[PDB]
Design an enzyme around this catalytic site. Structure first.
Site, PDB file in Angstrom:
ATOM      1  N   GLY B 129       0.795  -1.218   0.000  1.00  0.00           N
ATOM      2  CA  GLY B 129       0.000   0.000   0.000  1.00  0.00           C
ATOM      3  C   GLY B 129       0.828   1.268   0.000  1.00  0.00           C
ATOM      4  CD  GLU B 156      29.753  -0.090   3.333  1.00  0.00           C
ATOM      5  OE1 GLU B 156      28.912  -0.965   3.633  1.00  0.00           O
ATOM      6  OE2 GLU B 156      30.299  -0.035   2.210  1.00  0.00           O
TER       7      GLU B 156
END
Ligand SMILES: Cc1cc2nc3c(=O)[nH]c(=O)nc-3n(C[C@H](O)[C@H](O)[C@H](O)COP(=O)(O)O)c2cc1C
Ligand SMILES: Cc1cc2nc3c(=O)[nH]c(=O)nc-3n(C[C@H](O)[C@H](O)[C@H](O)COP(=O)(O)O)c2cc1C
Ligand SMILES: [Mg+2]
Ligand SMILES: [Mg+2]
Ligand SMILES: [Mg+2]
Ligand SMILES: [Mg+2]
Ligand SMILES: [Mg+2]
Lengths: 204, 204
Positions: B129, B156
């Site tokens: 959705g 990272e």
């Protein structure tokens, strides 16, 4: 056993609204403890904020049938054969509402269904690397013979077709990839793992 | 049986990127066929665009064990007791890469795991959705006795701890809500439904 760190081990410094519309996208700025014993620097993550949902698996334990709802989900378009999906009854939980009240309201609006007894299935994070969304799934006792036709609130651009299948048929559709949205996969796998006891409990 | 409409039954008028940073938020503008006949008006939906993922369930069929990875997911904070989650190996699919290539690379980077055979589990839409994200899950053959320590690319800000548990314990943690992210719930429910045959297949 289990996880290592708690909310005592992370500080959210700030959240910045990156986008404000129907939904929001926030930048969380935070620091947290590292497994090696240190503290991280400041980390930022973009988080899609779209509230939280109640999901209903409508199960008829007498007939061993499941009610599915079909509707378009345009976001499925780029990776799916069709954007019309077979799913569970579901909707957003607004402030002060219970999961079960939302499930009952959506079952009426989306499938014309009254619900009898209910039990929790599972409550899950849809994709917690990038969205806060949690969805809480219930199983609800229904008479699948009453589930039929076209529903949804048209004034809300919600156009929904009811499908009734046997439980085994629904699960086969999961195996084959014909049902492939998280809420339905989780609910139907759960049903495959619990249907014996559930049918017994609800047909005594 | 099955779905009613296809891509020929929807017209995507335009997409507009409303926000672009690490991820994107796009507005889809479209019209689509209605079940009772005719076409909807123009509808807009805000869609979180973050690409798609490969997921690996690391399963040791000799020992009936699974390898879990633990890392912070700040989006879990507001609805969970801790934002550190127990999860599947997973990573983003870059242009030109296969699900299997990504799954095998991430298993090494995130858990120090070499992977033997793989098999598909399921490919699912996380929350269609509001997001286009699809995640494709494989089960991968591993030696869980080689799984330990702290991994992830620290340059990272990916700080990951490895955990080894029995399959039964991992599944119990799904039932109890201690594992409650979609990728892990789907993978471990699948494993609970298929492990007997899988162990026979992989220990021949
Ligand atoms: C391996 C890696 C993974 C990242 N993952 C995310 C992520 O999941 N969500 C996010 O919002 N940003 C992510 N980022 C982006 C970083 O938060 C940051 O915006 C980017 O590295 C630029 O940092 P700088 O502005 O200090 O140079 C990631 C960056 C790297 C290098
Ligand atoms: C009941 C209802 C549900 C909606 N659901 C979504 C949604 O899932 N995603 C979205 O981007 N907008 C959603 N919207 C917002 C509409 O797409 C639209 O932006 C809003 O109704 C304003 O339209 P207007 O500019 O014509 O006044 C919803 C609106 C309503 C009334
Ligand atoms: Mg505190
Ligand atoms: Mg709905
Ligand atoms: Mg609804
Ligand atoms: Mg991971
Ligand atoms: Mg990684």
């Amino acid at each position: 056993q289990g996880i290592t760190f708690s909310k005592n081990d992370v500080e959210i410094i700030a959240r910045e609204t990156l986008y404000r519309g129907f939904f929001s996208l926030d930048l969380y700025r935070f620091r947290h403890r590292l497994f090696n014993g240190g503290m991280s620097g400041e980390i930022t993550r973009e988080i899609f904020e779209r509230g939280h949902a109640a999901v209903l698996l409508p199960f008829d334990p007498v007939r061993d049938e499941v009610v599915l709802v079909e509707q378009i989900r345009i976001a499925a378009y780029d990776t799916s054969e069709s954007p019309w999906l077979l799913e569970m009854v579901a909707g957003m939980i607004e402030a002060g509402e219970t999961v079960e009240d939302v499930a009952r309201r959506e079952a009426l609006e989306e499938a014309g269904l009254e619900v009898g007894r209910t039990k929790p299935i599972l409550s899950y994070l849809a994709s917690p690397g990038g969205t806060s969304e949690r969805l809480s799934i219930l199983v609800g006792e229904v008479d699948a013979s009453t589930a039929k036709g076209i529903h949804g609130l048209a004034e809300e651009n919600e156009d929904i077709r009811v499908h009734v299948v046997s439980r085994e048929q629904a699960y086969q559709w999961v195996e084959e990839g014909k049902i492939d949205n998280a809420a339905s996969v989780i609910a139907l796998q759960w049903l495959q793992l619990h249907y014996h006891n559930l049918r017994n409990e609800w047909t005594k």
